Amino acid sequence: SSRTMTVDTGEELRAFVEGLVESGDYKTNSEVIRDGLRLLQEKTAGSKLAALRLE
Amino acid sequence: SSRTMTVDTGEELRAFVEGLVESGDYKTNSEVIRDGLRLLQEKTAGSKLAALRLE
Amino acid sequence: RTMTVDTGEELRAFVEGLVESGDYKTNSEVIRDGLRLLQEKTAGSKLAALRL
Amino acid sequence: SSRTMTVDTGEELRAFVEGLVESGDYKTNSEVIRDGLRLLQEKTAGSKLAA
Amino acid sequence: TMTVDTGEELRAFVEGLVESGDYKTNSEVIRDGLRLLQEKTAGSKLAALRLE
Amino acid sequence: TMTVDTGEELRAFVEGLVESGDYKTNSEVIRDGLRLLQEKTAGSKLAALRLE
Amino acid sequence: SSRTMTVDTGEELRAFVEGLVESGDYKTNSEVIRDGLRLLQEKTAGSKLAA
Amino acid sequence: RTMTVDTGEELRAFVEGLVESGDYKTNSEVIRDGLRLLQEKTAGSKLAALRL
Amino acid sequence: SSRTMTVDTGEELRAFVEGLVESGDYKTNSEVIRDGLRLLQEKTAGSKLAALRLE
Amino acid sequence: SSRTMTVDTGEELRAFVEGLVESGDYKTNSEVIRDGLRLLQEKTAGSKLAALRLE
Amino acid sequence: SSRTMTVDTGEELRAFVEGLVESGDYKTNSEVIRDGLRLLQEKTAGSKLAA
Amino acid sequence: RTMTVDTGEELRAFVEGLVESGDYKTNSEVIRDGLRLLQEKTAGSKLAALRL
Amino acid sequence: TMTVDTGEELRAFVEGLVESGDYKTNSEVIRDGLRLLQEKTAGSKLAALRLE
Amino acid sequence: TMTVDTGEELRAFVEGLVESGDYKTNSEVIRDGLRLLQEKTAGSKLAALRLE
Amino acid sequence: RTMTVDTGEELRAFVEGLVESGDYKTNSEVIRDGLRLLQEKTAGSKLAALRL
Amino acid sequence: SSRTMTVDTGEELRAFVEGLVESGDYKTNSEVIRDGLRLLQEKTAGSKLAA
C-alpha cells in the first residue's frame, strides 16, 4: 500500500505545505500532498474531458 | 526557487499521478503534484476557515 | 467498536470546543458527525460514480 | 493535552473508514478522521451560526 | 413518547424558539428538526447510493 | 432531560437512523436535527432581519 | 369535509399574518394561509423524500 | 390565539395527509410550518429590503 | 383596502386562471391575479433596473 | 382570442400596476396583469407539484 | 417623439412573434416586442458593462 | 418583412440610447436582439417543455 | 469599416446565422459577438482588478 | 476575407483589446467574439429545441 | 515577443485540432486564448484577493 | 511531431506568464502554458458545441 516519490514543489508551495502542517490540520507533509491529489482526482473524475475521453 | 521533498502518496494515488503524466496533460510527476497543491491552495484561501482565522 | 486515532492537539481543541458549546455531548459524537459529512461527500462524489 | 483520541464509531462507520484506507486514497484510519474533522471545521467556520 | 438528552444549550435553543412564538411547544421544535433531518437524509446522495 | 412527542413514524425514522449505525443513540439523532435547525435558524434572512 | 379551518397560530404568527394583510398584498387572513400552504405543498412535492 | 380561515377542500386534504404521514401532529402544526416558510421568504425578499 | 379593475387577459390565460381555481390551490380568480402580481412585484423589486433607476 | 374579467386586486397592488404603466414599460393595465400571469404560468409549469400531479 | 415603431424583423422573427400571439399568452405583436425590450432593458441595466 | 408596433415613448428612448451608444446600428437591430432573447427564453422555458 | 480574417468555417457560422433569419446581415452577427465579448470583458474579475 | 460595419465605438473596443496586449490583431478579437457567440448558440435551449 | 515552451505531443495535437477546426487561425492564437482564460481565473481567484 | 512550441504571446501576456513563475506557483514558463491549455481543453470538452 505504501509508495514514496521525490517531487520538486518549489519554495513557495513548500512553504504553503509546511504552513498547513504547522496549523495542525494535517500531521505530515505527505498528508497535505495526498489531500491535494485527492482534490485533483475528484476534479479529474467529474471533468467533462474525462466524460469525453470515455465515449 | 527550486525545492524538493520526498512524500509517501501510496500506490493508488501514485498510479493516479502516473496516469496524468501518461496522458500528456502534464510533463512530470512534480507538475501533477504542483497542480494539486495549487488547487488545495486556492481552496484554502477562499475557505471560510481562512476568513475566520484572519479576524 | 472503538478506533484509536492521531488527531493532533489543534484538532482536539476544535473537537473539545464543539463539546463545550453543548451542540455535541461527547468527543466521539463530534467525530461521528465528521465521518457522516465525509461519507455523504464520498458517496455523492464524481469519483464515486466513476469507480462504479 | 493528547494528540491521540479513541473514538466510538460503531462497526458501520469503522467499516466506512477502513474502506477508504483499503481504497488507497488515505494511508491511515487517523488520516480519514482528520479529513472528516477538516470538513466539519470548514462547515462550522462558514456557518451563519458562526457569524 | 421519546426522552432525549439534549444538553441545556440545546434546551435553551428550543425554548427560545417557543418563546419567539413561531413554535407552540418544545415537541414541535424537535419534530421540525427531525423533518429537516429526514428531508436531508432522503435526498442524500448516500441514500441515493444505498436505495437509488 | 427533555421529553418530546414525536409520533411513531418519527420514532421509526430516528430508530432507523440508529440501526444504520451512522448514529449511536436516539438522542444523537435529535441533537443532529436540532443542530440542523439551529444552523438554518441562524442563517435565516429573518434572523438577519431581527438581529442583522 | 370542511373548507373552513380554525388554526392555533399564536399571537406572533397572527401578527405576521395581519401585517401582510395590512400591507395590502393579501386581501384576507385566509389568503395568507393559502399562500403559505402553497409554499409547503410545492416543497413537499419536490422534496427528495417525496421521490 | 386562533384564526378562522377558508382553506378549501383540496388544501385541507393536503393538510390532513401531512398529518396522517405522522410528520405533523395537528392541522394547526402544518399551518404554522407553512407560515414559517412564508415568513422566511417574506423577510429575505428583495421587496422586503426595498420597503425598508 | 379593496379595489377592482376589469382586465383583458385573453382566453388562454383566462383558462390558465380558471384551472388554478379549479385545483383548489386558490379560492377566487382575484386571488390568482393577486398572486401573479405579487410575483411580478418581487421580480421588479430585485431587478437590476429598479436598482439602476434608484441611483 | 379576447376575454375580459373584473378582479379585486386591492389598492396597494393596483398602485403597483399603475406605476408600471406610468413607467412606460407596459402600455395598459391589462398588459401588466398578463405579464404577471405569464410569470405565474411559467412557475406553475416547472413546479415539482405540476410534475408530481402529472405522474 | 413616436410611440409607434416599424421594425425590420424578417419573416422568421415575425413568424416567432405571430406564434406567441396565436398561443394567446400575448394579445398583440406590440406586446411581444415590449416583452423582449423589457428583457433587454433588464439585461443591459444589470450588465457589468452598465456598472 | 416589417412589423408596426406600439413601443411607447420611454421604450423608444431606451431603444435610441442603445443606438447612440454605438453597440447597435439601427432601431430594428435593437428589437431583433430583444426578440432573440425572448425566443431563447421561450424555447428553454419549462412551459415550452410542458406544451410539447 | 473593418476588414477581418475569419477563416471560412467562421464565415459559414455567420452566414448560417443570417440564413436562420434571427439576424439580417453578417455585420449584425459580428456586432452581436462583440457585444457578447464586451459584456464578458467588462464583467471580468480581471477588469475588476484593473479598474475596480 | 470578411468586411463588417462595426461602427466606431465597437472599433474602439476592439482596438482597446489589441492595445491591452491580450490580443494581437483586430481579427483575433472578432474571432474570439464569434467563438463566444458560437458556443452560446450551440448551447442554446433553442438550438436544443431545433436539433435536440 | 516569443516564448519557447514544452507542450508535449498530446497537447500539441489538441492545439492543432483547434486550428484545423478553423475556430483559431494559428497555434499561437490558441495559446493566447488559453492564457486569457488563466489570466481571468487568476485575477478572480480567492488567492488573488488574499495576496493583496 | 514536436513537443516544443514557440508562441507569439506579446510582451504583456509574457509578463503575465513570468509573473506566475516569479510567484513560485509554477516552475517554468512551459508549465504555465500547459495550465492554460488544460483550462481550454476542459472548456472545449464540456462545451455544448462539443456535444
Automatic annotation (TrEMBL), chains A, B, I, J:
Keyword annotations for this protein, in alphabetical order, are: Plasmid, Toxin-antitoxin system
Tell me which domain of life the UniProt entry assigns to the organism this sequence originates from.
Bacteria
Any one Gene Ontology BP term:
regulation of DNA-templated transcription
Q: Which family does it belong to?
A: Belongs to the ParD antitoxin family.
Instruction: Describe the function of this protein.
Output: Antitoxin component of a type II toxin-antitoxin (TA) system. Neutralizes the effect of toxin ParE.
Q: Protein name, please?
A: Antitoxin ParD
Q: Which organism is it from?
A: Pseudoalteromonas rubra
Q: What is the lineage of its organism?
A: Bacteria, Pseudomonadati, Pseudomonadota, Gammaproteobacteria, Alteromonadales
TrEMBL record, chains C, H, L, O:
Keyword Kinase among record annotations: no
Q: What's in the keyword line of the UniProt record?
A: Plasmid, Toxin-antitoxin system
The residue ranges crossing the membrane are: none
Q: Does the keyword Heme apply?
A: no
Swiss-Prot/TrEMBL GO biological process terms: regulation of DNA-templated transcription
Going by the entry's taxonomy, the superkingdom of the source organism is recorded as: Bacteria
The family note in this entry says: Belongs to the ParD antitoxin family.
Q: What does this protein do?
A: Antitoxin component of a type II toxin-antitoxin (TA) system. Neutralizes the effect of toxin ParE.
Q: What is this protein called?
A: Antitoxin ParD
Query: What part of the entire protein does this chain span?
Result: 4 to 54 of 86
TrEMBL record, chains E, F, M, N:
Protein name (database record):
Antitoxin ParD
GO BP annotations listed: regulation of DNA-templated transcription
Q: Does the keyword Lipid metabolism apply?
A: no
Functional summary from the UniProt entry: Antitoxin component of a type II toxin-antitoxin (TA) system. Neutralizes the effect of toxin ParE.
Which keywords does the record carry? Answer: Plasmid, Toxin-antitoxin system
Q: Give the superkingdom in one word.
A: Bacteria
- Organism (species): Pseudoalteromonas rubra
Tell me which family the UniProt entry assigns to this protein: Belongs to the ParD antitoxin family.
Whole protein: which stretch is covered?
5 to 54 of 86
